[PDB]
Amino acid sequence: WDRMEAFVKQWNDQQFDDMYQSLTKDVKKEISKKDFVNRYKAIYEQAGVKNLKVTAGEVDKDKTMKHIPYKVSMNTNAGKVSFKNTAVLKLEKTDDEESWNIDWDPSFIFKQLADDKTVQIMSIEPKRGQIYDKNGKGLAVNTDVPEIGIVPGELGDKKEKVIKELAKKLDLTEDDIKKKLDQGWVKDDSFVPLKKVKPDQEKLVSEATSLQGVTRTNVSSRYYPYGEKTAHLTGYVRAITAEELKKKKEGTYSDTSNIGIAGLENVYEDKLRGTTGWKIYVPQTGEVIAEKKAKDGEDLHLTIDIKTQMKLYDELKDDSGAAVALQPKTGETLALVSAPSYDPNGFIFGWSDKEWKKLNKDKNNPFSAKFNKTYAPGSTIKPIAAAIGIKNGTLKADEKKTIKGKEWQKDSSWGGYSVTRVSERLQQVDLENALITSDNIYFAQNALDMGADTFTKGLKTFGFSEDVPYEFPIQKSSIANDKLDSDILLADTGYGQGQMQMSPLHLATAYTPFVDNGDLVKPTLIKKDSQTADVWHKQVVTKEGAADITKGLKGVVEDERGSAYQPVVKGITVAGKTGTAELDGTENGWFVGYDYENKDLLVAMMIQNVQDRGGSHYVVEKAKKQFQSN
């Protein structure tokens, strides 16, 4: 019949407002359309009802009352659910027109339901996988932390004064505690959790539990054992919002779930979470409509060495910038540091108000990692360019160039603009002395002699303009705002005063061909039991070209004329390059270096607001400390 088919179509399509219209006059009373629609929406939403199939059968007796059997199957967060039932169709006249109407009752939601029975949907959170460094040191783990609560029966006739004192002691409100004590499940002998506390605060727990009826347990909790020292690398988890929950695939989260918002917590959310358990049941009888068991998440093992991480943190902790430390042979990531930072434990245990407001008004954006953003690299481009110039035959490292004065233009067509070098001591300038004196004209002429096409292709072999193959998302490096579309922009990009932007991670990666082999190494955060150093582009420079570049980068640190000579550090065997990118404004300082003798460490460091602190020098002093002085 038409009415039944239309009702079934509306219900398969889950349009409950259209469904309410077909109900009998009796059911219209005692159940308002508001309550009908709200009850369906709430139950189906919270249970995760999807894949709904309602199919109708055949009538039996032939009249003003019919019976039509039907069946319902569906998928819920707790599994497949299906039942059979019989709809009563009564013919009824309202106003002046008859119609067949369905005599609805709560058993059309789930079969167990009736006018004295409801449904409840509880969830079981799995154990989240943990994050370890290369030596098994826990970076994002699960630990048992104190949990202060109230047993109501133990309060006696002191409930009010106890709530007042405990609210003052735990920085909660009296209303919040009372709301928790008034929950439906709360019985006089049950422990009512009130607040989770960090492990280092047993004195607070001792003070608080010494009140009437206030007691203590331990609850499992995420914990970030090194806090802001690894905050950008771990990221964090925190409670999911109702709006976030509405966007996810039903079943994967509940209203009380943690979700990874930033860092590796977010990047590996699926691996770390696991499977959420569910139970749909009827509270008046205890009957279970459906049930699904949880499943723990998987652990994550990183290449990070927390010792290197902490050395870099100690150097950057009061500044604004980033530092990457790679093992340039294997491509493993020893350290990823960004400053300023934050304690991700704040998102688990709660923030103090002053700290939250501090972090949100900080103009250097503590919650944002800087090692995956792209900044102007400045002079640090020069060796890379040199590599390309040696790779594509247009540059010989041992041949000197004629440069007279401190200014140079290609021809009259530049006019008022010329490339400026800081010194004019050397008139015959080879590659080594070009790097040591950071000669801008040398490298402008390198770019020009090279041409735009070869230089673009070369920059692409060092990983510009492509997705960065790395497990932590890295914004792509840019050669120019559009393209190298003029001799002037080409020359400026040659010596690092153009439109280019690199990430610290990428700059670290792009000095790896200089260390030994010439290969651009594929960086990785994930610890692998395989001792296989993956290559990202093969032989982007030759071995002998890498040696030629290493000579000049060595000189930058060891020759008195170099930009990285001060401070003189006995013991280190470090070759590298400095940079300063300007922004009455500020300027950012760069140092990229590697151990040209031990070949097992490379660091890139970038610090902001260094114009009044000696520029790149301020960075250099902090960078040399990171290297083996043995």
Taking a C-beta distance cutoff of 8 angstroms, is the pair 420, 491 a contact? no
One-letter amino acid for residue 349 of the chain: F
Taking a C-beta distance cutoff of 8 angstroms, is the pair 564, 578 a contact? yes
DSSP 117-143: B--EEEEEPPPPP-EE-TTS-EEEEEE
Nearest-5° angle of CA 455, CA 459, CA 463? 165
Breaks (C-N over 2.5 A) in the chain follow: 62, 583
HSE (CB half, 13 Å, CA atoms) of 492? 18
Q: State the CB neighbour count (10 A cutoff) for residue 88.
A: 14
Q: Pick the catalytic residue: 379, 477, 503, 563? A: 379
| DSSP three-state, residue 583 | coil
Q: State the CB neighbour count (10 A cutoff) for residue 21.
A: 13
Both tokens of 119, joined, read 């449904």
CA 84 to chain centre: 47
State the burial class of residue 90 (Cβ atoms within 10 Å of its Cβ: 0-12, 13-18, 19+).
middle
Which residue do the tokens 């799995």 mark? 126
Does 82 participate in catalysis according to the annotation? Answer: no
Taking a C-beta distance cutoff of 8 angstroms, is the pair 7, 54 a contact? no
HSE (CB half, 13 Å, CA atoms) of 249? 6
State the burial class of residue 66 (Cβ atoms within 10 Å of its Cβ: 0-12, 13-18, 19+).
middle
**Selection from 494, 337, 479, 317 nearest residue 401 by Cα:** 494
Nearest-5° angle of CA 419, CA 420, CA 421? 125
| DSSP three-state, residue 291 | strand
Taking a C-beta distance cutoff of 8 angstroms, is the pair 221, 239 a contact? no
DSSP 247-279: HSPTTS--TT-EEEEEHHHHHTHHHHH-B-EEE
Nearest-5° angle of CA 38, CA 43, CA 47? 150
Using the CB atoms, write b or e for 209-234: b if 16+ within 10 Å: eebebbeeeeeebbbbebebbbbbbb
| DSSP three-state, residue 237 | strand
- For strand 131-132 and strand 300-301, is the pairing parallel, antiparallel, or unpaired? parallel
Taking a C-beta distance cutoff of 8 angstroms, is the pair 510, 466 a contact? no
Which residue do the tokens 């398969």 mark? 12
* Residues designated catalytic: 379
